[PDB]
Write a protein that binds this ligand. Structure first.
Ligand SMILES: NC(=O)c1ccc[n+]([C@@H]2O[C@H](COP(=O)([O-])OP(=O)(O)OC[C@H]3O[C@@H](n4cnc5c(N)ncnc54)[C@H](OP(=O)(O)O)[C@@H]3O)[C@@H](O)[C@H]2O)c1
Ligand SMILES: C[C@H]1COc2c1c(Oc1cccc(C#N)c1)cc1nc(N)nc(N)c21
Length: 244
């Protein structure tokens, strides 16, 4: 049987007359000020190997790649897989950014060593560029073999849409819900130009099941309560959905 594909996403609800939309992006970035708890959660979960000596891959659309600040990318300690229709051009630029990243990470390792820090086996950092999502999945399987850890689809909307359309991989969604705190017992809504490709079918569980906190916990390898938690002007909670 074939390994699960996990979409991981943060959404914000936007009630419209016809349905609640799930906003994910505005102007090529996220819709909200930085949420430290979502960031660290995303980082720990996407990095965490499912067994020793493996590295997780994140499959992303080219715009989501670009949405990460250049100095932080490709994102460390994972295999970054950038899906594009211009492999040739994007390859050259990713290769360049990887090389700069390698340079930053090497200097840090040398410094860490130099100040008497304990080093240990950890997941590796790579970036590769593919012509499609299916191509990306193939490409990472072929390059990494049994060193491949968990595969995450990290966005954005076009790539998620493609994941959800793949021919029957179980697909699971690990979702962080983001809401503004009420002001006069009313909650404002974030402006978004990019939305998750499905919304009502998750909130109404049509073809999807919302899973126990214990099940999310197993997927992501750290405790998830499914409780709301306050983070400044937002509250957030983590939930999961499996296709039925
Ligand atoms: N809140 C979250 O959890 C989250 C996560 C990720 C992203 N986002 C947000 O979403 C926005 C970006 O989303 P998006 O939907 O506009 O972009 P996206 O899906 O990240 O990327 C679109 C790009 O991916 C490439 N691509 C897409 N489909 C393809 C296919 N079928 N075959 C080959 N290449 C393909 C194309 O790259 P080329 O143009 O280079 O061909 C396309 O322009 C940003 O605002 C970002 O901040 C939010
Ligand atoms: C990376 C963008 C794209 O996807 C995601 C991103 C993100 O922002 C950043 C920005 C800079 C570094 C890192 C890191 N590491 C994350 C946060 C995310 N949160 C959730 N819950 N889900 C996703 N898919 C996310």
């Amino acid at each position: 049987p074939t390994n699960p594909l996990t979409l991981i996403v943060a959404t914000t609800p936007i009630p419209t007359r016809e349905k609640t939309l799930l906003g994910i992006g505005l102007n090529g970035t996220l819709p909200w000020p930085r949420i430290k708890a979502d960031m660290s959660f995303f980082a720990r979960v996407t990095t965490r190997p499912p067994r020793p000596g493996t590295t997780n891959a994140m499959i992303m659309g080219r715009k989501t790649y670009d949405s990460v600040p250049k100095s932080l990318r490709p994102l460390g300690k994972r295999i970054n897989v950038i899906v594009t229709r211009d492999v040739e051009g994007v390859s050259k630029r990713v290769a360049e950014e990887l090389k700069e990243k390698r340079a930053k990470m090497a200097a840090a390792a040398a410094a860490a060593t130099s100040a008497g820090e304990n080093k240990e086996e950890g997941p590796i950092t790579d970036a590769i560029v593919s012509s499609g999502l299916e191509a990306a999945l193939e490409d990472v399987e072929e390059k990494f073999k049994g060193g491949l850890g968990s595969v995450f689809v990290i966005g954005g909307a076009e790539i998620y849409a493609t994941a959800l359309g793949l021919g029957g991989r179980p697909v699971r969604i690990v979702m962080t819900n983001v809401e503004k705190k009420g002001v006069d017992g009313e909650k404002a809504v974030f402006e978004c130009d990019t939305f998750f490709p499905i919304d009502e079918e998750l909130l109404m569980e049509k073809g999807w099941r919302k899973v126990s906190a214990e099940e999310v916990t197993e997927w992501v390898g750290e405790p998830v309560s499914g409780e709301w938690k306050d983070e400044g002007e937002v509250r957030i909670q983590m939930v999961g959905y499996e296709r039925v």
